[PDB]
């Protein structure tokens, strides 16, 4: 209906088999923790494909549909270079080239997505950009205590990677939700308390826009913020929206997420 929200979490992930390093899987899900557990099932109930390491996830999608299409393109879409080139290949290099293609050279560039690595070696192969996909505007993060050059010579090695990788995926998922919860609760507090006017149109406010900095005093109509942001390359989405009060670089999709969510939760 007219109250559908941007998902709290929706990501597109790459799995790499811990023992079979040239085996990959691309999927998408609103709960990576649960999904990775299904993917691995039980190692006791076998060719060694399982267990999988989730090595990277792209998240922040405005909906399931847009995540599905990122997934489709990742799996079977074409690479580009700053024009179109060869279809996505088999190696880790090709899998990671497609990410760069989609985020940097494709319309996805405008969605303020986050690319997160759970494996540092996979992060560096990506940063490498072997095929020179690109010579902003997404986020790249790497897990604290990310895995480095994986050992898989032994059973204990393999079970260790699996185990640490779970913890790492769990930490990103729970922190993200918790950070969203905290930020939401403080925006609600701001609305329930003050009778604040929009910074721009000065009319007592129905969708809201706040700063990321939850102690900052910037508040406005969502459509007013957009107008200001489009005023001071971008034609239809503000790609580097600085807050007019603190100048912290905002993510416009983030601002919409809380706007939509705060509106939804009320009703």
- Give the number of C-alpha atoms closer than 13 A to the C-alpha of residue 193, restricted to the C-beta side: 7
Token pair 């995926």: residue: 169
Cβ 151 to a copy of itself shortest distance, Å: 34
Write the DSSP string, 21-42.
TT-EEEEEES-HHHHHHHHH--
Beta bridge partners of 78: 87
| Number of C-beta neighbours around residue 155 at 10 A | 10
DSSP state of 50: P
How many chain residues are in contact with a copy of itself, going by CB under 8 A?
A: 37
**The pair of three-digit structure tokens given for residue 70, joined into one six-digit string:** 């990122």
Considering only residues 18 to 47 of the shown chain, the ones binding Cl ion according to CB under 5 A are 46-47
x/- letters, 206..245, toward Zn ion (CB under 5 A): -----x-x--x-x--x--x------------------x-x
Residue closer to Cl ion (CB basis): 45 or 203: 45
Considering only residues 8 to 37 of the shown chain, the ones binding a copy of itself according to CB under 8 A are 29-30
Residue closer to Cl ion (CB basis): 45 or 46: 46
| Number of C-beta neighbours around residue 119 at 10 A | 26
What is the binding site for a copy of itself (CB under 8 A)?
Answer: 1-2, 4, 6-7, 29-30, 62-66, 68-69, 72-73, 75-78, 80, 84, 101-102, 106-107, 110, 223, 226-227, 230, 233, 235-237, 256, 260
């Amino acid at each position: 209906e007219e109250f559908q929200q941007i998902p709290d979490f929706y990501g597109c992930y790459l799995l790499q088999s811990i023992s079979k390093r040239q085996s990959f899987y691309i999927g998408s899900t609103p709960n990576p923790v649960r999904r990775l557990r299904q993917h691995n099932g039980s190692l006791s109930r076998r060719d060694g494909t399982r267990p999988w390491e989730m090595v990277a996830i792209v998240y922040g999608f405005p909906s399931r549909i847009a995540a599905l299409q990122f997934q489709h393109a990742w799996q079977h879409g074409y690479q580009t270079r700053y024009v179109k080139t060869r279809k996505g290949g088999r190696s880790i290099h090709h899998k990671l080239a497609m990410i760069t293609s989609l985020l940097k050279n494709e319309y996805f560039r405008y969605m303020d997505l986050t690319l997160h690595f759970f494996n540092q070696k996979v992060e560096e192969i990506w940063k490498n950009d072997k095929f020179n996909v690109s010579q902003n505007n997404y986020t790249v993060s790497l897990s604290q205590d990310a895995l480095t050059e994986i050992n898989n010579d032994t059973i204990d090695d393999i079970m260790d990677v699996n185990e640490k990788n779970m913890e790492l995926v769990q930490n990103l998922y729970s922190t993200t939700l918790a950070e969203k919860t905290k930020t939401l609760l403080l925006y609600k507090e701001k609305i329930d308390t003050g009778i604040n006017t929009c910074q721009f149109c000065n009319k007592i406010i129905n969708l809201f826009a706040f700063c990321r900095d939850t102690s900052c005093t910037f508040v406005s109509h969502l459509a007013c913020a957009y107008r200001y942001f489009m005023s001071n390359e971008d034609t239809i989405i503000p790609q580097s929206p600085k807050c007019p009060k603190c100048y912290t670089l905002l993510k416009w999709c983030d601002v919409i997420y809380y706007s939509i969510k705060l509106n939804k939760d009320n009703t």
